[PDB]
Ligand binder design. Structure first.
Ligand SMILES: CC(=O)N[C@@H]1[C@@H](O)[C@@H](O)[C@@H](CO)O[C@@H]1O
Ligand SMILES: CC(=O)N[C@@H]1[C@@H](O)[C@@H](O)[C@@H](CO)O[C@@H]1O
Length: 441
């Protein structure tokens, strides 16, 4: 009756990466073969598998004897974290009708049309397919969201769960939410290969890649409550994450975007002065049904270690004390609040960049934290004075400075601390690094 017990108990395969070696830690001890070009990259909670488009980039799981036939007629669930780069507008046109498998239990080099299951991608569709020994087929075709900023197959880590109840349906869940279904009654025996293969199969795009992590198979159809628990069990709050879902790091350029106003980029009035929000330009393609606010405009920021401490980790952990800089023209300019500097009457302190008035204390110590909204890859930043008193969470305040136009100006405010359960909050920030999985069209 413990969901954790149930999850544990029904697990019959669990790909784990430890000491740079991939193995099955289910207890079934299935043998895992890693070919030379399967790579390891940063994942959701440790390293993940990365597959490029060549023959030597694959990971094969040879089923242990005990679990060789558990999906001929039994219910099963497959789960894994998945990361797919955003498909360019030219690649949707050129390769959009090309379906390629990434994970499959179906033979193909001996038995003319492999019965079994597979996970595939086709343009912006994620496809689950079941095929019985009579060649009968059931498919779930999930069509991704047109807005690529909020979509599931657009360079962010997302959690996939597909449950198969032989008496009723197969259901596809993304980040714990039901997004696709298919009635699978009438499917007969599902008699797969003795191998589960992770590899790009039949992909015409030579530069395509995918990343997969925590590949897991359960011998039952999970219910929604078990899936929810499964999904959140991976979200460890110890390390902060960037916009793509990877570990946030020190000494790396990030473009900041407010979670509550995702249409807005950050801009600098002048060095020594304040920051404010501007509208990001957008990309629209009606014929391909794709659109998104363009990334990588606005300020670039860098996170630096407040003190060295204990051991140098490249990743930023929740609770870390840091210093934030704006990076432009090969120069770094610290972000802070000058003692007695301009602030709104309610005490929203206006943040300043490269402030350097002689004699004036400049408050720049921050704590990088995760205070809320667990499944979202966002961060909060808490500013302190020199006595280590809270100056508040970094957020924005609407108003005007001098004769400037009215703007959402970056501030630090303690007000946010009494609203941490709200749905949407002005102190949540996305940290976006330039990445090869996302190029604006
Ligand atoms: C030029 C500039 O913005 N300088 C800052 C400096 O003022 C100080 O805050 C330091 C942090 O210990 O980091 C930077 O070098
Ligand atoms: C943050 C803030 O108040 N900035 C303003 C700045 O924009 C400018 O108007 C200046 C004039 O001396 O007064 C302040 O420094």
């Amino acid at each position: 009756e413990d969901i954790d017990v149930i999850l544990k108990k029904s697990t019959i395969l669990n790909l784990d990466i430890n000491n740079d070696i991939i193995s099955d830690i289910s207890g079934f001890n299935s043998s895992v073969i890693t070919y030379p070009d399967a790579q390891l990259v940063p994942g959701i909670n440790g390293k993940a598998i990365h597959l490029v488009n060549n023959e030597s980039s694959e990971v094969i799981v040879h089923k242990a004897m005990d679990i060789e036939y558990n999906d001929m007629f039994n219910n099963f669930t497959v789960s894994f974290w998945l990361r797919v780069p955003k498909v360019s507008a030219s690649h949707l046109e050129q390769y959009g009708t090309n379906e390629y498998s990434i994970i499959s239990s179906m033979k193909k080099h001996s038995l003319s049309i492999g019965s079994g299951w597979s996970v595939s991608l086709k343009g912006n569709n994620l496809i689950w397919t079941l095929k019985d020994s009579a060649g009968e087929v059931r498919q779930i075709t999930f069509r991704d969201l047109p807005d690529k900023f909020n979509a599931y197959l657009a360079n962010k880590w997302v959690f996939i769960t597909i449950t198969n109840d032989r008496l009723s349906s197969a259901n596809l869940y993304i980040n714990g939410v039901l997004m696709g279904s298919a009635e699978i009654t009438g499917l007969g025996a599902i008699r797969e290969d003795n191998n589960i293969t992770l590899k790009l199969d039949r992909c015409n795009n030579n530069n395509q890649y995918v990343s997969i992590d925590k590949f897991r198979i359960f011998c039952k159809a999970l219910n929604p409550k078990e899936i929810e628990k499964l999904y959140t069990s991976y979200l460890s709050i110890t390390f902060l994450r960037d916009f793509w879902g990877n570990p946030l790091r020190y000494d790396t350029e990030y473009y900041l975007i407010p979670v509550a106003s995702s249409s807005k980029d950050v801009q600098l009035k002048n060095i020594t002065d304040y920051m404010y929000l501007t509208n990001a330009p957008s990309y629209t393609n009606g014929k391909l049904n794709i659109y998104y606010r363009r990334l990588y405009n606005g300020l670039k920021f860098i996170i630096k270690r407040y003190t060295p401490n204990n051991e140098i980790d490249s990743f930023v952990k929740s609770g870390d004390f840091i210093k934030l800089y704006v990076s432009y023209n090969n120069n770094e300019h610290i972000v802070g609040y000058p003692k007695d500097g301009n602030a709104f009457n309610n005490l929203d302190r206006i943040l300043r960049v490269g402030y350097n008035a002689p004699g004036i204390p400049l408050y720049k110590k921050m704590e990088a934290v995760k205070l809320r909204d667990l499944k979202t890859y966002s961060v909060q930043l808490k500013l302190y004075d020199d006595k280590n008193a809270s100056l508040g969470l970094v957020g924005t305040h609407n108003g005007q400075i001098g004769n400037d136009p009215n703007r959402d100006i970056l501030i630090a405010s303690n007000w946010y601390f009494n609203h941490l359960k709200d749905k949407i909050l002005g102190c949540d920030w996305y940290f976006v690094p330039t990445d090869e999985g996302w190029t604006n069209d």
